[PDB]
Amino acid sequence: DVNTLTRFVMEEGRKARGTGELTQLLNSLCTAVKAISSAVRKAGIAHLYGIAGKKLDVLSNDLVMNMLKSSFATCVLVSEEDKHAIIVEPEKRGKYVVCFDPLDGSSNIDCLVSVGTIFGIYRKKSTDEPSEKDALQPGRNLVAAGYALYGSATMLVLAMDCGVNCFMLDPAIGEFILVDKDVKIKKKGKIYSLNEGYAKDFDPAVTEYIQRKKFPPDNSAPYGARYVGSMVADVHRTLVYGGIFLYPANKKSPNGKLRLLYECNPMAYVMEKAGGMATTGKEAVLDVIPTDIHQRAPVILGSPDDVLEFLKVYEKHS
Amino acid sequence: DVNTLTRFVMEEGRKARGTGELTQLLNSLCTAVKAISSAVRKAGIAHLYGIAGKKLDVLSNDLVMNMLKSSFATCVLVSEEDKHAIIVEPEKRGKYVVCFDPLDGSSNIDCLVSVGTIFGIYRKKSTDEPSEKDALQPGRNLVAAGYALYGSATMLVLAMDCGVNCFMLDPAIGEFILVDKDVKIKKKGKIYSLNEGYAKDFDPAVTEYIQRKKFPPDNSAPYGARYVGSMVADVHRTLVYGGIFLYPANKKSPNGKLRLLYECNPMAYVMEKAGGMATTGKEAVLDVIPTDIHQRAPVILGSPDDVLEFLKVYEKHS
Amino acid sequence: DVNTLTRFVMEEGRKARGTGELTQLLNSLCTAVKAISSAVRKAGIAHLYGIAGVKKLDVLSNDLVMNMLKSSFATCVLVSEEDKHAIIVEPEKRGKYVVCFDPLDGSSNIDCLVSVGTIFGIYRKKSTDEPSEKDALQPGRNLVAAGYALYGSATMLVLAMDCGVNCFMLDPAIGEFILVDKDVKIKKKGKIYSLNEGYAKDFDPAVTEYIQRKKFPPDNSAPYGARYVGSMVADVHRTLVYGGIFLYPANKKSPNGKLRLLYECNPMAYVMEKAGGMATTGKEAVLDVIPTDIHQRAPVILGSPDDVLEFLKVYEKHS
Amino acid sequence: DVNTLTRFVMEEGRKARGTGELTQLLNSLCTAVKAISSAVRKAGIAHLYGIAGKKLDVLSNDLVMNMLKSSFATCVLVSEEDKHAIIVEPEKRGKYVVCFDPLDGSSNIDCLVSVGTIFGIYRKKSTDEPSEKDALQPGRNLVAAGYALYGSATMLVLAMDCGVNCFMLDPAIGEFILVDKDVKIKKKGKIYSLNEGYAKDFDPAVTEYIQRKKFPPDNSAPYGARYVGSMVADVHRTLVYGGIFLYPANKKSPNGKLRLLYECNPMAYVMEKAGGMATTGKEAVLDVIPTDIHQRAPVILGSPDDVLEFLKVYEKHS
């Protein structure tokens, strides 16, 4: 029996016996994603080049922003594109807070590399007039999170308390088809992913770990290397093939480079629900209590046995 | 003045004042690429999942094969998917020979990583009955070559004697729109791309070069690292952002992993026409005279100053 | 504030405070319509013609609606022009709704690329017995929802419920039905009459006189314009948008008409009434006819109120 | 062997051994039709309705106009949209003249009725400066003509000296697939098409003919009636199913309502090449020598036996 994202979310929402808000929120996000996908695949670019005589990131942000506001399910929106959290006007407020990167990897879009949309959904915990403070909850409080990968094909990975599910976007009918139910990452992988250009600045623990991947002390087979540069792409490969992904702090970016609210937490949540791990080295990413909506955070995630191995090396250096 | 691949190829073909065969050949390939793109983006996948109640590689190979045969411009077809060269039936023979990888990076199409179609076109030099021998020409003989990148968006890079041009596929109207005329790679880049998992088996020259990229002896800024795993994707980034791409040889692989006829030469051709370089370490990729249609060849390509620097290190170890 | 069919139905469903079944049913139907639309516009036809080196559209359309409805868990009895007998949903997928539909109306003529569509009518099962064909035998007046999908120059879904009629345009770029017409109402009177005049020789005197009054206004007004696509979905939609009258009456050879009551007449009748129009068989409101056979025929005259009313006056003159 | 509009036109053009202009013109028209089709099916309408926070006929006219001008194959363009013929700037002139209706039936598009694009191509005869005079040639001089039907599916019917061919537009890959070679209309049909609302003003000949279709002389079965209102739709059904289409001159418009240059001639040309007929009642539509680019002309076309029958009745009343 075929299943779509819409049908899936409707059912899960019905079971929850709530207001139906989250269902509306996700429906809206889904529509936005479809819109972004169309734009990312360059639909209509011929008109831009004069067949008949705004930047992608901006448009993407506008789509998510507008669809979420018009859902009546949110009150506070935090986006990679905006400096301050956006407070939904009173007549359209809902109980959810959403953090997202409308178009991840958009900086290197020129080369047509994969790009994506990452999102994390929280329930407003505070009772004060909505404000940026409502977005400062530890990832552990996420009600739902996931991403949309705009690669060879467009896929939306949705993670909720009940697990992780993958939907393929069928461009023929603009419908997200469920193709992977209750997904689980491999216990251990054979791929490590990180920008080794920072080798000169790596922390000793990271240096040793990578070393153990290239020169297994047990003469096992060396891990293969892959690094697309687009977090959505790299994390998704990790989920599918297993392995490990890293963007640790550089002595140049002491607090890591990736953002906690809309890049780290969402991926961390997806990994954990899929049976994987996500650490900053010192603690689980999901446990970090944010103080600034755009704060950075180091992150090592992927197959449990792999993350655990890194942690062993991390401790050896602490 | 908007320009499409069809219009462009028709005009360049008209100027050549020939049979018009190459024009037909490229038109055919173009249609095939659009077909592949549709399939790659999962159009119709809902039917595969029972909405109404087997492989991409094979389908892609069938599309290029049939479109090329039906163009009446080819006589010998060499495909990464086929063990032997395909000899076009007599009643559909043309004067061109085409070598191609219908779906490059397909081994990893499961994580939705970018994939592409690489192609190289030669003119049959002999009148002997068409045979695999006609595909054994040095890349320097290429009449045209390029690739189709199925990434965030689908793009077709076409290189001919007159230069390199990039066309973006507008899904809305199924038309390839010219968006980059007479492209030229940067003289020097800041990105190095290769699977460092093979570090343990690297040739000393490769090891030292990568080391100079991570720890510049002149204390310059270290190069950034990127490696998608899909040649089309990696080479295209190199073209767009500049830098260097490597898939070198070592003791266990005296001649590399990538294939000369349909992976190395096409990319080598594109690079040279764009002002870049492509070496095997011992000589220009395009100068290698093939003896086997599926023979492998080591390859280092990209920005000239970068390839030249590699060659300096290579020589140091020779 | 942009609005989509999915958002709209979810909202209306939430307000109803029910099981959420109808919401799932409509979502499913909507997905099916998108699928049919894709097929109707010939997506992938290149493969059928050997680009790489395959059933009829009506069949496929029927399969899509059938499967999407069954898989919704909101239905128990499905009636389609395609199947002779009502389909009883297996026990593990039963819902409380009954659906009558024509998966691809006008399909008898898709070779000329004429407009085609999907008509649907939704009823609530009103029995405590094992689901059967009998549950589809309710007068149109019992409809909970009904409408159609028009596959014309663009694909549009007209949805009529107790709260009114709303039109959604299908944006192929994102596969989303965008609300472009809220609480639609047909014109009080139109200037277009639609029917196959080829059957002139067999027309009922009332029909003959009426058409005559449209071509030669007695009060010397301007004669009505004529339009007849042949595809009910197309002709009814034009009537809705431009007003006027549409007819497929009974004749000598066809005493009860040609169109089907359950999935062609009732749905359209329901849509017209909710939009302020009328739908009569000549003897009574289409919606009031109590069916006895799921595939029974019924004559139908529908459209602008003043126009249907005028026909009725002529009909009575001949009774 | 699959065949596309592009491949077909390139081959026929090559055989003609000419400048290649007509090939470029048709390619351009083809791309424009795809663009119009996308617009007609409402692609992107969501943005029009604020998903992210000009008229179809105008856009359609702009697309054809620009694509034709940029083909370098035209010099004089006549469109229903413009009052005066458009003279192509000197630096983009070709030897062809094109008359067209960018979006036929656009007046009643609000009901989603079928719409289409009609076109007629002539070769500039004269040697003087291009002017409106160059579009005043009898249909008999057409080099090519046809239309694009935007119905349940988009189809382009192309008629040239070698016959009539039909191409289905595959939205998945934006390619026109040849699905009907050297088409021929039925010798006689069973459908008559015309707006009977004008009954009160019909010419006696028309009245009698219609009468013979509803109450058959040879005891035969009455013809079925169909009238969409969109010429492109009605003419296409006639071509496919055979029969007759009429828009005669009543008492009011003594010259008919349809336009000769871009509505009647193109259709007339298509019919004749398909073995059908097209008369004004007094003479073959293609034989009428125009004096005004927007002049009207009565027209009765379709199956030969049907047109012939009309003519017999027409003469009885003359």
Ligand SMILES: O=P(O)(O)COc1cccc2c1-c1ncsc1C2
């Ligand atoms: O937002 P509400 O409708 O008040 C509650 O919705 C939920 C409460 C708990 C768990 C889930 C949902 C929910 N809504 C849609 S999917 C899903 C999973």
Ligand SMILES: O=P(O)(O)COc1cccc2c1-c1ncsc1C2
């Ligand atoms: O195949 P022919 O028409 O005989 C020769 O075509 C060419 C000969 C030389 C250079 C070019 C072409 C050609 N054909 C299409 S683009 C292009 C560039």
Ligand SMILES: O=P(O)(O)COc1cccc2c1-c1ncsc1C2
């Ligand atoms: O199927 P139920 O959820 O039990 C009842 O649904 C309804 C009951 C009355 C009115 C409406 C709906 C409904 N469901 C979706 S839109 C809409 C309008």
Ligand SMILES: O=P(O)(O)COc1cccc2c1-c1ncsc1C2
């Ligand atoms: O415009 P030219 O290439 O100089 C002449 O083209 C033709 C001359 C006669 C007949 C045909 C063509 C032509 N060009 C494309 S299809 C087709 C049929």
